[PDB]
């Protein structure tokens, strides 16, 4: 049984939040 469109969008949104946290860590490590 395949995944739904909503599951892919959920994963992409959680990854976008994780990427925001990553940018935050990278900027903190920089300065």
């Amino acid at each position: 049984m395949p995944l739904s469109d909503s599951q892919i969008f959920i994963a992409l949104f959680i990854a976008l939040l994780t990427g925001i946290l990553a940018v935050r860590l990278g900027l903190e490590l920089y300065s």
Binding site: D5, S6, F9, I10, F13, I14, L17
Partner: protein, 204 residues
């Protein structure tokens, strides 16, 4: 800039700023109408003020026309323009003639106006209350047009029928039972958890 308020004043709708205890940016000091210190991605300035106003003003007419069309039985609003090349050219020429003066006024006055009535107001009555009401109604109108489009995408019925279905069954006819339910729930959780992360930034 007549869109600037007579006096700097941040209004109160359950709080002053977009979450309780939120700091305001240095460039948002309450001089603008609808100021809530809300620019977390620091996009902001005055060109974006006419951008917000223009999008809001077009959205007022959009939501008014859609609600009036749905109030009568004039079919779906999204299929309405389909119910060509000379017309496209003449409309684009007329609207571009409008936008010529709209863009020219910003180079000199810092405002847009309509043609040369840069404070376009033949009947006066302009005040800070009118400015704040205009910006808040524009924001509400463009949120309402996005709601119209999203409700027409998720359900084939018009916005009046969606309101009737929500009236009939409130807990079962809402966004959290539609196709976009789980991602909306996740966005709500992220939204409600974001300001505590921002306060962790502040206190640390």
């Amino acid at each position: 800039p007549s869109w600037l308020l007579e006096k700097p004043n941040r209004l109160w709708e359950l709080d002053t700023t977009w979450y309780p205890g939120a700091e305001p940016p240095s460039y948002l000091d309450g001089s603008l109408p609808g100021d809530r210190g809300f620019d977390p991605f620091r996009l902001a300035l005055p060109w974006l003020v006419e951008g917000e106003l223009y999008n809001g003003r077009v959205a007022m007419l959009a939501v008014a026309g859609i609600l009036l069309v749905e109030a009568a039985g004039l079919g779906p609003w999204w299929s309405a323009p389909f119910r060509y090349w000379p017309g496209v050219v003449v409309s684009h020429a007329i609207y571009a003639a409008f936008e010529l003066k709209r863009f020219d006024n910003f180079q000199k006055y810092g405002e847009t106006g309509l043609l040369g009535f840069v404070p376009f107001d033949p009947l006066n009555m302009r005040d800070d209350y009118k400015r704040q009401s205009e910006v808040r109604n524009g924001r509400l109108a463009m949120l309402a047009f996005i709601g119209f489009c999203s409700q027409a995408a998720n359900t084939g019925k018009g916005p009046l029928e969606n309101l009737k279905d929500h009236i009939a069954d409130p807990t079962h006819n809402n966004i959290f039972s539609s196709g976009v339910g789980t991602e909306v729930t996740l966005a709500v959780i992220a939204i409600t958890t974001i300001p505590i992360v921002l306060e962790a930034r502040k206190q640390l």
